[PDB]
């Protein structure tokens, strides 16, 4: 039962950078019969079922970009991406088929970008959730870089820390950007104690936070 | 074109079994091994087993992780591959593929199903609540609330918008998931163009449609 390791563990590259990611067997995939090394390449974009890059080590399978090469043999295996593009965001998989089969534990291959600020957009609850005893007050970050950023929330100018989930999308494929929800839930009753609503996105871009804001009572 | 399709996934309780099926199409099913493979959500690929070709008399291999407790077999007649799958636990939680394995000779998996999320868990099946999301570019959304197990699918206008959607992974607290889902448009077509958002949630049998009308 042949264990396999992949290095490193992440990248992060830039458009049109040189990239290698390495691959180990605890065994030898190389068959003696047929003198080829049983070892593939598999590319896994979010949300994305895994595809086929390489086999037999460095065989290309139909279609897929000269950029993408495989190489070595025996116990040690290298994919290399000769000109990153940004459509290339993926976990990459090696996989032996000597005996059995087995994979590496991936290496994510992440874009690094110029920095981008976000576009910020807020949702007061809906008249549909307040009439069920709900209330969700919705802050979408769109298409920033890079992922991390400050999301604030200020009730009547306090701000709020209690209640707020955020969650981001996978990196786009296009631009390379990320995108961001935050959601502060609230009962209705607390919800309508107060009027002035704001989001505040604090990112690297700028001393200066992107706000939006809206006041209940105006609605 | 080679086609695989993943079914019987979803919810099952700890201790119970499922039956996955993987229909497949435009290739001699007989003359390939097939494997199964799984994803725990955020983490790594693991082969289970694999159940070969005619040549080799259609003879099975599995992992150590579940040999003994899983079972492969296939419908040669009907070009179907199945996992049996028992006694699961939450490790078993996981999205399952099936992928067309070896020939004979060529060693790749080629051709890889879309998968079926399997979810370990007790909790109980609860439909989500939609709650519309109403505003160069303008922003529209909507939320996708109090509902259990994964998966939801939303789409914006039955599929007529893409290019400018943002669709939030869920998030669970007191067994309940909750996402949201944006798209953004050009204000020369919006309101001129209805903008809807679709959500099904086959667990439940809900399948809603919820118009964003401005305010
Ligand atoms: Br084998
Ligand atoms: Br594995
Ligand atoms: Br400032
Ligand atoms: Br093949
Ligand atoms: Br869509």
């Known amino acids: 039962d042949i264990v396999m390791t992949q290095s490193p563990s992440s990248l992060a590259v830039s458009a049109g950078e040189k990239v290698t990611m390495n691959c180990k067997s605890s065994?030898?995939?190389?068959?003696?019969?047929?003198?080829?090394?049983?070892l593939a390449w598999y590319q896994q974009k979010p949300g994305q079922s895994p595809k086929l890059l390489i086999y037999w080590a460095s065989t290309r399978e139909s279609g897929v970009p000269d950029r993408f090469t495989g190489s070595g043999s025996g116990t040690d295996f290298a994919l290399t991406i000769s000109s990153v593009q940004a459509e290339d965001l993926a976990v990459y998989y090696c996989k032996q088929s000597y005996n059995l089969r087995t994979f590496g534990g991936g290496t994510k291959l992440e874009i690094k970008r110029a920095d981008a600020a976000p576009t910020v957009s807020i949702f007061p609850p809906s008249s549909e959730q307040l009439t069920s005893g709900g209330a969700s007050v919705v802050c979408f970050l769109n298409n920033f870089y890079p992922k991390d950023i400050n999301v604030k929330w200020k009730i009547d100018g306090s701000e709020r820390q209690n209640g707020v989930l955020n969650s981001w999308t996978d990196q786009d494929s296009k631009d390379s950007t990320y995108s961001m929800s935050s959601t502060l839930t609230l009962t209705k009753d607390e919800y309508e104690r107060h009027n002035s609503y704001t989001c505040e996105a604090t990112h690297k871009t700028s001393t200066s936070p992107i706000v939006k804001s809206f006041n209940r009572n105006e609605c | 074109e080679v086609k695989l399709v993943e079914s019987g996934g979803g919810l099952v309780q700890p201790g119970g079994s499922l039956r996955l099926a993987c229909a497949t199409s435009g290739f001699t099913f007989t003359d390939y091994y097939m494997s199964w493979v799984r994803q725990p959500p955020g983490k790594a690929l693991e082969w289970l087993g694999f159940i070969r070709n005619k040549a080799k008399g259609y003879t099975t291999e599995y992992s150590a992780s579940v040999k003994g407790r899983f079972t492969i077999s296939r419908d040669n007649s009907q070009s179907s591959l199945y996992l049996q799958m028992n006694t699961l636990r939450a490790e078993d939680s996981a999205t399952y593929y099936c992928?067309?394995?070896?020939?004979?000779?060529?060693?790749?998996?080629?051709?890889w199903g879309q998968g079926t999320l399997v979810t370990v868990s007790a909790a109980k099946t609860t439909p989500p609540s939609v709650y519309p999301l109403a505003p160069s570019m303008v922003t529209l959304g909507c939320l996708v609330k109090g509902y259990f197990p994964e998966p939801v699918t939303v789409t914006w206008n039955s599929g007529s918008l893409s290019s400018g959607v943002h669709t939030f992974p869920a998030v669970l607290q007191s067994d309940l998931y909750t996402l949201s889902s944006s798209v953004t448009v050009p204000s020369s077509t919006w309101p001129s163009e209805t903008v809807t958002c679709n959500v099904a949630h086959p667990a439940s049998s809900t399948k809603v449609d919820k118009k964003i009308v401005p305010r």
């Open positions: 065994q030898s995939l190389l068959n003696s019969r047929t003198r080829k090394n049983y």
């Open positions: 992928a067309r394995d070896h020939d004979g000779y060529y060693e790749r998996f080629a051709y």
